[PDB]
Structures are given as C-alpha cells and as structure tokens.
Design a protein around this ligand. Structure first.
Ligand SMILES: *[C@H](O)[C@H](C[C@@H]1CCNC1=O)NC(=O)[C@H](CC(C)C)NC(=O)OC[C@@H]1C[C@H]1c1ccc(OC)cc1
Ligand SMILES: [Cl-]
Lengths: 298, 299
C-alpha cells in the first residue's frame, strides 16, 4: 500500500497567489509566502523570461495573496533562484515546525496537490534518477509542495513548476533550485534517460515476501558486482554497499540475504513475470524505499 | 493514473485515543461525542465471544480514558449503537468539520487515515470490495481509524476499522456501527465471500482511457444491461445496477459513448482478451478507480 504522510500540517500553509491573469499556489510560513517565480510572467515573457528584469518592474501591490477569504498584504518581495518570497504583514499561526531539504534521487515524499490555494489530493512520489517526478498535476497546480514528516517536523523538499511533454513533472527545492536540467521557460523539455531505483525494487520484493508472496524467489545467489553488471544492462541503478546495509533489517526479518534477493531480481529481469503479478502489480515497483517498507510493516 | 487520497487535515483534527484498562484504540471526536469500536471494552479474553451488553453494564463513564494527545477529555455519558460506542464528552471539538455519516456501496473508494494511539500515521485510498472487505494497511492498534470522502466543505465518514481476516484483508463498520458484509466483532476466524471484479470501475477506467485518446477497444456493437450482466458473471465480474449506470452518466456524456456501448466493448475484452495490447499502459484492467476518481484526477 502506497502511503502518504497526513497532510494537515501542510494544508494550513497553502494560500493562493495571483499576479495579472496567472494564479497558482503559495506556501505561507511565518510571515513569508513562497511560490514559483513564473507567476510574474505573461505570454510575451514565457519563452525567454528575464526574471530579474520582470521582477524589478513589479510592486508589492501587484501580488494578490489570499488565505481563504482573507487577503494578506504583501510588504516586500525577493527572489531566490526560481522561487519568489513574498513578505506579508501577518504571521501564519498554523506554521508547523519545519525545515527545507533537498532530496536525493530514489527518495520518496508526499505531494499535496492544490488548486487556487485549496488542497485537492495527497499522494506519494519518488524523485526519479533523472530528477523528474511521476506526479498528477493539472493547470493551476504550481506551488504545490512535496514533503516528509518526522515527529513534529515537516521537511519540505519539492515545489511544483512544470510538466514535460512525456507527462512527467519537474520542479525545485524550496531554495528554488530545480531538480534536473530543467528551466522555468515555456518550452518542450526532455529529461535524461530514466532508470529504475534498484534498492527500492528490492525493498518492495521483501515486502511481497513479508506478506506471503514469494513465487519469484530462487535457490541461487550472486555477487554484488555481477548483479550490478546485469542491473546496468537493464537500466537499473547500481546497488551500493550502503544500499545492502540499509536493506539489512528487511533481510533479517525475512531471513533472505540481500544478495539472494538480488539473484531473484536478476531472474525476474532476465525471465520476466511469466505473465504473473507481485503484490497485485504486473510491473516491478520502485517507489517504496526500505524505510517506507519498514515503517508500514511497523 | 494513481491512487490519490483526500487531504486528511480535517479528519486529523478529529482523532483521539480511547482506552479501557490496557486496551487502547482510536476514536473520532465530532462535536461533543467520541465514536469508537465497542470492542475497546473487551479484555483479551472477552474477545473470543464477548457479551457486549453484559460487558457494558459493568462499565461507568469514569472507566473510559479519552485523550486528545496527552489531554484527557472527560466522559459524561456512554451508549452502544450496533458495533460502535458513543462516548459523550464535556468539550465540543473546536476542529469539528462540516460532516455527515454515509454508508457506501461496494466499489466505492475512500481515503483511510491510519492512526495509532490517536496519532495519524498515513493516508491512502481504499476500495470497498464486492465481498465487503478492504485491502488496508492496518496493524495492531489501528482500530477506530476511519475512512472518508470530502465533498466541498463536507467530510462524509463511511468506514471505521475493526478487524483483520485470516486472509489479511480488513473489515469494519459504518459510523452507525453496522458492519459492511457478513462479519461480527469477535476474535473468531471468519471468511469473506469470493471476491469479484468491480465492473463499474473498470468501465470508468475504459472511459478514462478514451478521454486520453486510447480507444482501440471501442467496437461497433451494443448490448442490453441484462445480457451484459449475465456474461459478466461468467468472468467473475459484478453485475451492474441502475445506480452504476447512472454514475457513469457524466463520463458517457463527456465521451459521447453510451454506457451500454462501453459494456459491449468490455464484453469483447472479456471474451476475446486483450490480444497482447495495453490500455492506459497496462495489460490489466483496473477496478479501483470510481467514476468520481476519474473526474477528480483528470480535472
Ligand atoms: C503551473 O500550474 C503549471 C503546471 C503544469 C500545467 C499542466 N500540468 C502541470 O504540471 N506550469 C506550467 O504550465 C509551466 C510554466 C513554465 C513558465 C515553467 N509550463 C508547462 O508545464 O508547460 C507544459 C508543456 C509541455 C510544454 C510545452 C511548451 C511549449 C511548447 O511549444 C513550443 C510545447 C510544449
Ligand atoms: Cl436489461
């Protein structure tokens, strides 16, 4: 079961930001609202926006920020990379304990998809190795954020900016730096070749075992390097020794050595499913981390 | 297409914990009432075949420990309604949303806010199977977690969690304490009926495929509803009801494909198979997206 973090602490931070005829979402923390800077663009701007030039021509009053029924007055603005920081005269009393983090490819996070400052849905995503995310985002979703929650603390890792022609998604960390080679201009952009997140496939195979499904297992083993040669051939990410270590708990819990599971995955890559399924899926799933699998079996 | 849950914040604001002795589970605090599974009053020994009426007569308001976080909520009345306990408390929950209690039909989906000790752990989308089980992710201490949909301002609570079956699927009640399906809250082995495929949701999924331009499977024929239902049953698909036909109305109107024409297309897929083709990038027909889920995601 793909499980998202409860979204309430983030919902209390979502607001609507309008500049001209463009509306998207912002993240309101203490007295600052964070949003994608392309809100300040028009059509004649989209293709090669000189953002510093476009922004110097704006006044605080060109930014309409709405939290529910209430307008928040903008008293100052600045730009950090691809994010605009709007200072407002009110502090958000619902601001959670938080930090900004930049996540690594292969890590997972929850997305709170919003439209016109209103939360619409929540789901789990992974940062792909090619730094896209396979999200569900429509017009008006920009400024939706991705996050993880640990104890009382919300770690914001993603703010949404764009869709690629292939239907995957691209965005920034909360410092406004893109994940991947993408640019906030209105042009058709391709990503690099994606690969499958191998440590996550292995965690999901252990999950299938824990839950009684183990038809894909075999009596064989493999060395780490020989597995990695096969993985790379099938556009799977290499498995590191730290990945093996990270998988220890699941290996212990099931009594299946990591390199034994690697041998099973090799067999699946070479043979296929035989038209069968694992945990319901006809495809190998790679957006559960070892931590995810552990926490949901704990 | 992915399972998308509703934002959980309005339900998070309603979760509490309810303890009787050492048995702790979750409760739902709306206005000045806390709702929770009645088996909270059972010792791990009453659970074999509890006499719930006799167990409740031995309890008093002061035997129930209700906490929102570490803050005790004083209980001032208690009653049992089917398989749920209603604990009247002396504080109205200031975070009570607009809400209603609804009893859903098989095939309908809902979000579950999985909770432990009154604390939310995660949120995910579930479908009520035709055999009245859900495939949840529930561990010990999850009972009293609820399932819900949100429409406009309003939370429609439809599920409260009570138990796991031998097979690992999950069973529970509506918020009036009436179980979905033929289950009882006793620690006995109970079997669900054989499961079937949720036809109305597969049809919704075929409509979504058409909306996205994937329409190779549309054929020139049509069928009656009765003929389709009789065929569908031979493939372990649910028969359609009139309400199913109606809730496909909007997708039929969006695509211009009559419901019964889509039924004829599905019937051909059932009888002839996919012949190696995929739909929406899948050789498997998906049955856990309702017609409303398709509208939610695509708009
Ligand atoms: C913000 O809400 C918006 C979210 C998008 C809209 C649909 N789904 C989403 O996730 N963001 C955008 O529309 C950005 C704005 C830029 C200034 C960063 N652009 C896009 O997401 O465009 C997507 C289309 C593939 C792009 C494309 C562009 C230009 C073409 O012609 C030369 C062709 C295709
Ligand atoms: Cl008929």
């Amino acid at each position: 079961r793909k499980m998202a973090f409860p979204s309430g602490k983030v919902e209390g931070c979502m607001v609507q930001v309008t500049c001209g005829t463009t509306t998207l979402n912002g993240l309101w923390l203490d007295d600052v609202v964070y949003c994608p800077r392309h809100v300040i663009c028009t059509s004649e701007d989209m293709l090669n926006p000189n953002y510093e030039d476009l922004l110097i021509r704006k006044s605080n009053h060109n930014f309409l920020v709405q939290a529910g029924n209430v307008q928040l007055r903008v008293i100052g603005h600045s730009m950090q990379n691809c994010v605009l920081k709007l200072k407002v005269d009110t502090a958000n009393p619902k601001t959670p304990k938080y930090k900004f983090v930049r996540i690594q490819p292969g890590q997972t996070f929850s997305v709170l998809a919003c439209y016109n400052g209103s939360p619409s849905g929540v789901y789990q995503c992974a940062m792909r190795p090619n730094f896209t995310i396979k999200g569900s985002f429509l017009n008006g979703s920009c400024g939706s954020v991705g996050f993880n929650i640990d104890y009382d603390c919300v770690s914001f890792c993603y703010m949404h900016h764009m869709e690629l022609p292939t239907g995957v998604h691209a965005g920034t960390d909360l410092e406004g730096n893109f994940y991947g080679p993408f640019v906030d201009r209105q042009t058709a952009q391709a990503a690099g070749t994606d690969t499958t997140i191998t440590v996550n496939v292995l965690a999901w195979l252990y999950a299938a075992v824990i839950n009684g499904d183990r038809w894909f297992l075999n009596r064989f083993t493999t060395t780490l390097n020989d597995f990695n040669l096969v993985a790379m051939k099938y556009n799977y990410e290499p498995l590191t020794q730290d990945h093996v270590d990270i998988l220890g708990p699941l290996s212990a819990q099931t009594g299946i050595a990591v390199l034994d599971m690697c041998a099973s995955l090799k067999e699946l890559l070479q043979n296929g499913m035989n038209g069968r399924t694992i945990l319901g899926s006809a495809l190998l799933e790679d957006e559960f981390t070892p931590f995810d699998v552990v926490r949901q079996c704990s």
